[PDB]
Amino acid sequence: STAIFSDRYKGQRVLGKGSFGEVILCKDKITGQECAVKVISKRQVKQKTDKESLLREVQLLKQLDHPNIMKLYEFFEDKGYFYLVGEVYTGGELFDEIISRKRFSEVDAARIIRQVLSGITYMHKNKIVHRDLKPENLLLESKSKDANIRIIDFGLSTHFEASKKMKDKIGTAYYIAPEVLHGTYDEKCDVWSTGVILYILLSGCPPFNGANEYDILKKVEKGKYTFELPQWKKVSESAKDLIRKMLTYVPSMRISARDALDHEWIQTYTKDVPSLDNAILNIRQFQGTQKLAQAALLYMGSKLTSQDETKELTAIFHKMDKNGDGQLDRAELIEGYKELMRMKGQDASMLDASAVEHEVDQVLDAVDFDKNGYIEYSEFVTVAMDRKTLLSRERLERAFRMFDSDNSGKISSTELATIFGVSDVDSETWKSVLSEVDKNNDGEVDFDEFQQMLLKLCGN
Ligand SMILES: CCOc1ccc2ccc(-c3nn(CC(C)C)c4ncnc(N)c34)cc2c1
Structure with missing residues (x-):
């Protein structure tokens, strides 16, 4: 029988996003060994090779050993994902x-x-x-x-598009x-x-x-x-x-x-x-510019994902709410949040049932609601989604501050050109959006103005 990734590993936290997937800091449930798992979603990443050829490459990689090469320890695969388990670097x-x-x-x-x-x-x-x-x-x-x-x-790009x-x-x-x-x-x-x-x-x-x-x-x-x-x-x-x-x-x-x-x-x-x-x-x-353009694209993505997941989550709960009084219990919010993850693939962070229970409890513990009673789902939806974004909203801000090396509070139009060029946002499109935000012709934007431009560049 096939071995299962979450039988062996629990997720601690997300380390970041790299090529082909999210990377999660995980811990072996028995030995306590920490590892870095790259989770590749099959829906989002197509394979280039046959299963056979991938299995043999994995097997070789588990045997290779060099001090300047990431050590690969394990490989798992299920219906939706591939899980590449390797050594954590800090x-x-x-x-x-x-x-x-x-x-x-x-x-x-x-x-x-x-x-x-x-x-x-x-x-x-x-x-x-x-x-x-x-x-x-x-x-x-x-x-x-x-x-x-x-x-x-090493070796990934040969097997995945x-x-x-x-x-x-x-x-x-x-x-x-x-x-x-x-x-x-x-x-x-x-x-x-x-x-x-x-x-x-x-x-x-x-x-x-x-x-x-x-x-x-x-x-x-x-x-x-x-x-x-x-x-x-x-x-x-x-x-x-x-x-x-x-x-x-x-x-x-x-x-x-x-x-x-x-x-x-x-x-x-x-x-x-x-x-x-x-x-x-x-x-x-160079670095600051690259990091800010990356953060800008993630922020725009995160806003779209939120628009998508907010409405989905509400429809799931409405359906679930048989009586139609707006009141679900904690196990129901969990089943609905699970339903959302079943439909989505976006969360490598929600590996198993137990990570989802925990995430629900985090939202409840913030929302001033008792976890042992019945709960207004519309309020729960509002809090759950901010949780996911603000990570990106505060990383956007963090990245704007790091880029603003002079602590001027502002990014110049020239700098915007550079940033959007790297982000591959069309030049007349961003200028257009900047025209709609910079009506004083300052030729520069503060953080809130920058954020407003990005919301406008993703249909808000
Ligand atoms: C065949 C090589 O394919 C893999 C397989 C597993 C990985 C696990 C972690 C990482 C990894 N990716 N990242 C960088 C992330 C934060 C973007 C790591 N940070 C610390 N330690 C790590 N090991 C990583 C990359 C992987 C690449």
Whole structure:
């Protein structure tokens, strides 16, 4: 008989959203082992391969072992989902840690890139390609400072189709190898992606850039880039030589991961070296922008999900309310909330019956109602839904504050252009919405105004 994920694991909390699914911090019900589970919804993510081929890849991945590669422990599958259980890392994304440091030299970059190349080299030896390598897939193992980089998502993109949705696409275009765009690719695509990441570590700007996703993709496909920016004047010849070799257009002429590890630049800088201050500055701006556009798309999504789940939940309860007096008990609210999850797939957070009981009790305990009596469902619906959004509403706010590095209270129109370009919101569409909110021609918006624009960009 098939083994069941929630027989073995309980959810602690959501860690975040990555490629193909939500990632949840889980705990083994017997051993207390904490793990990070990536939950992939079959409704939302299509498979590329047969079951057979996926099972064999999983089995291989459970056996592979390298210090710069996320350890996979278990794999489960049921009717609606795939569950990929792996080791928890607590150090967060590499670039998030880099923006927090006072100095950053080529030696720091070389030590980072060596780790990435070492992980990749090993995976290539095992005939596993990443293809979607980017900064978000480089996690630090712990929150220490000599912490190792662990690369996540190796092998996934071969078996599951990427989302076409921008909220899931943010960041992808800078890093993708040109040959991946055209369909004929091999493991060399991962060296290209690393070259891009390295270019960014040493200058703070993407080598291939543009005002929207398609403009970025157009630059990538032409494959041309330069080292003419001022901050390249501070950088060694050997680093630009390696970059050139990694960003070589024709894959057969591009350096391999293994050979890159032997490059002069890696050798010299990983065994009287200035800080790259202008690069740190550009990376923190790049990062903040990426994080705010991401938060803007999630917020818009969250509002739409709420509009959808509010009405669904009310209809479920109306139906359930046989007598029609507006009064359900706690087990009924639970059955209805379950009914909502049965219909939805959005909550990886509500893995089993027991997580749903708990969530109901959280809402009741907020709403000043006794859990042992009968309850007005319309009031319960109102509180339950804010719970889900405000997470995104307060993360939106948090992300607006982090982007506003000067504590000015405002985002300029130029900055909005940048943010919406990354978010791939049409230029005349956002300006139009900004016209409707900025009637004083300040050419800038505060947080509430920004939020209002986003509500207008999602049909509110
Ligand atoms: C074959 C590789 O496929 C997988 C399988 C499981 C994963 C579990 C966690 C993560 C993961 N994703 N994230 C980043 C999230 C917050 C976006 C993690 N943070 C900490 N520890 C982790 N392990 C993760 C990625 C996975 C990728």
